[PDB]
Amino acid sequence: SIDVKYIGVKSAYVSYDVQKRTIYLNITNTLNITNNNYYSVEVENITAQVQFSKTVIGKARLNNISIIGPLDMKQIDYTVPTVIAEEMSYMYDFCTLISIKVHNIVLMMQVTVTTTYFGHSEQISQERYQYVDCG
Amino acid sequence: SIDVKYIGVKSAYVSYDVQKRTIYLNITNTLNITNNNYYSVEVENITAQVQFSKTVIGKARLNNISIIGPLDMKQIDYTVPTVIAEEMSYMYDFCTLISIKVHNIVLMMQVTVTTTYFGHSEQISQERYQYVDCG
Amino acid sequence: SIDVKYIGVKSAYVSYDVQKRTIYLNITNTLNITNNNYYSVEVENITAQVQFSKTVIGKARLNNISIIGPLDMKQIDYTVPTVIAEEMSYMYDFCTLISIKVHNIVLMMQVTVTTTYFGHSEQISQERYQYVDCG
């Protein structure tokens, strides 16, 4: 919710970036920085009454007050059928980041069959870092 | 919730980056930094009443107040059928990060079949770091 | 929740990075840093009443108040059928990070069949670090 960032290279408060055939000569840098951060975040005052039946008095008849179902759920159920007579594959790979017929799956399930939940529920997913470097 | 970052290279408060045929000569750097962080975060005062029946008085009949189900759930259930007569693969790989017919799976399940939950629930997933480096 | 970071290379508060044919000569670096962090995080005050029946008075009849079921769950149930008459693989691999027909599975389950839960529940998954380095 606050300060969520994807940054391709670099993050700073003060940054000096001096490069590529440069003269940086006789310089006076003076910084008087005040940068206080005050966070009052997700401060919750919750008064909750949760009843299916609160009061029954006398010969009353109650049936099937809350029904959740039937429930039939399927997720990440794909199919990749391959029927081939003859394959030739020639692969020449030099200095390459390569993935071939790979299956990458992330499933995060947090509050899934609950009657009641009070408070804070959080999911964070930060995906893979992959690289190839050649001289 | 606060300060969630993906950063491709580097993170600083003060950064000096001086490089690649640079002269950095006779410099005065003076920094008076005040940077206090005050966090009052996910601060909860919760008063909760949770009843299926709070009060029953006299000859009352209560049946099936809360039904969850039947529940049928299936996850990460995919199919990869291969029928082949003949395969040739020639692979020549030099300085490669290479993945072939791999299955990578993460399942995180936190509060999954519950009547009641109070407080904080957190899932964090930070995926793989992989590289190839050649001179 | 606070300060969740994927950083590809380096993390610092003050960073000097001086490199690649650089002259760094006669410099006055003066730093007066105040950087106090105050955390009041996940401070919970919870008053909770959780009853299926709180009060029953007299000849009342209660049946099937809360039912969770039947429940059928299956996860990471994929299939990889292979039928081949003839295979040739030739693989030449030099300085390669290579994975072939591998199955990588991470399953984290925390609070999965509970009546009631009070407090903090945390799952953190930090995946594999792999590399190949060649001269």
Curated annotation (Swiss-Prot), chains A, B, C:
Disulfide bonds: C95-C134
Compartmental location: Late endosome membrane; Lysosome membrane; Cell membrane
Ranges facing Lumenal side: 1-135
Organ and tissue specificity: Expressed in the brain, including in the frontal cortex (at protein level). Expressed in lung epithelial cells.
Top-level lineage group: Eukaryota
Glycan attachment positions: N26, N32, N45, N64
SUBUNIT field: Can form homomers. Interacts (via N-terminus) with MAP6 (via C-terminus). Interacts (via C-terminus) with the vacuolar-type ATPase subunit ATP6AP1. Interacts (via N-terminus) with AP2M1 and CLTC. Interacts with TMEM106C. (Microbial infection) Interacts with SARS coronavirus-2/SARS-CoV-2 spike protein (via RBD domain).
The family this protein is said to belong to: Belongs to the TMEM106 family.
Biological role stated in the UniProt entry: In neurons, involved in the transport of late endosomes/lysosomes. May be involved in dendrite morphogenesis and maintenance by regulating lysosomal trafficking. May act as a molecular brake for retrograde transport of late endosomes/lysosomes, possibly via its interaction with MAP6. In motoneurons, may mediate the axonal transport of lysosomes and axonal sorting at the initial segment. (Microbial infection) Plays a role in human coronavirus SARS-CoV-2 infection, but not in common cold coronaviruses HCoV-229E and HCoV-OC43 infections. Involved in ACE2-independent SARS-CoV-2 cell entry. Required for post-endocytic stage of virus entry, facilitates spike-mediated membrane fusion. Virus attachment and endocytosis can also be mediated by other cell surface receptors.
Medical condition linked: Frontotemporal dementia 2: A form of dementia characterized by pathologic finding of frontotemporal lobar degeneration, presenile dementia with behavioral changes, deterioration of cognitive capacities and loss of memory. Gestural apraxia, parkinsonism, visual loss, and visual hallucinations are present in 25 to 40% of patients. Frontotemporal dementia and/or amyotrophic lateral sclerosis 1: An autosomal dominant neurodegenerative disorder characterized by adult onset of frontotemporal dementia and/or amyotrophic lateral sclerosis in an affected individual. There is high intrafamilial variation. Frontotemporal dementia is characterized by frontal and temporal lobe atrophy associated with neuronal loss, gliosis, and dementia. Patients exhibit progressive changes in social, behavioral, and/or language function.
UniProt protein name: Transmembrane protein 106B
Organism name: Homo sapiens (Human)
